[PDB]
Amino acid sequence: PNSLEAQIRQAMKTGSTLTIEFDQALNQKSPGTLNVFLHPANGGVRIDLDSGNQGEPAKILWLPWKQGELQTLQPGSISTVDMLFFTYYLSGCKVFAGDGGPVWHIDAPVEANQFWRRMSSDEWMEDWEVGTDRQVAYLHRAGQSDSLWNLSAYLEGAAPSTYGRDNLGQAVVGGIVTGRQQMSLYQYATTSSGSSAWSPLTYTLQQRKQ
């Protein structure tokens, strides 16, 4: 086969099943570029900081998870075509991505009004004038209380993407860099019944209401 990095990009683009196992230690690494090791794993790839065990070095874009709040990947970090992007598992978490803007990973318990207020301090948000449009990918867990995810007071457009059902399930989000400050996003989900294949995580047109 090709490199593990190539195998992940191919699985993403082909819509194949190839799971990702993240070492929890990655959450001690700040958002932005990160040198990791990829390893063979059962039905997928393990991403960690271990140089041994058939490890293949890769430089990725990384977005950690932090309990009770959000983390942000800035678009100025995004440069190298074909570089992979990952965030840590979504365990009831939300991910919001502006096309050409930041990516946010918001922990499950943070209320939508609270995390929107925190996001909105970002320069890209301050530049998003009321009554104007952006392309936005937004992913939340189906069956979670609306309080924790619903942005309909703020955004006009397509419904969010969802993972899971009945407030149960986990998701993986990653991406492939396509140019300066730009990525294509991909996702899969994990049920008590196993993991799905990769699929696109789509940007849709959203107008800022207020």
Residue numbers in the entry: 2 to 211
Paper text:
The presence of one or more oxygen atoms bound to the sulfur of the cysteine side chain clearly has the potential to alter the local geometry and therefore complicates an understanding of the interactions between the residues of the catalytic Cys-His dyad and the substrate. Analysis of the refined structure indicated that the sulfur had not been subject to the oxidation of its side chain, but the position of the sulfur atom of the cysteine side chain was otherwise unchanged. Furthermore, the multiple conformations of Ser92 that lie close to the active site in the partially oxidized structure were replaced by a single conformation. In this reduced BLF1 WT structure, the Sγ of Cys94 is 3.12 Å from the Nε2 of His106, consistent with a hydrogen bond between them. Analysis of the geometry of the hydrogen bond donor/acceptor atoms of the two residues indicates that the hydrogen bond has a more linear arrangement (D-H--A˚) if the proton resides on the Nε2 of His106 (160°) rather than on the Sγ of Cys94 (144°). Thus, it is reasonable to deduce that His106 is protonated indicating the presence of a thiolate-imidazolium ion pair stabilized by hydrogen bonding and consistent with the “ion pair” proposal for the mechanism of papain. A further significant conformation change at the BLF1 active site between WT BLF1 and the C94S BLF1:eIF4A∆20 complex is an alteration to the torsion angle of the side chain at residue 94. In WT BLF1 the cysteine at this position adopts a gauche+ conformation, whereas the conformation of Ser94 in the mutant is gauche–. We, therefore, presume that in the complex with the WT BLF1 toxin the cysteine adopts the most stable, anti-periplanar conformation of the side chain as seen in the structure of the fully reduced WT apoenzyme alone.
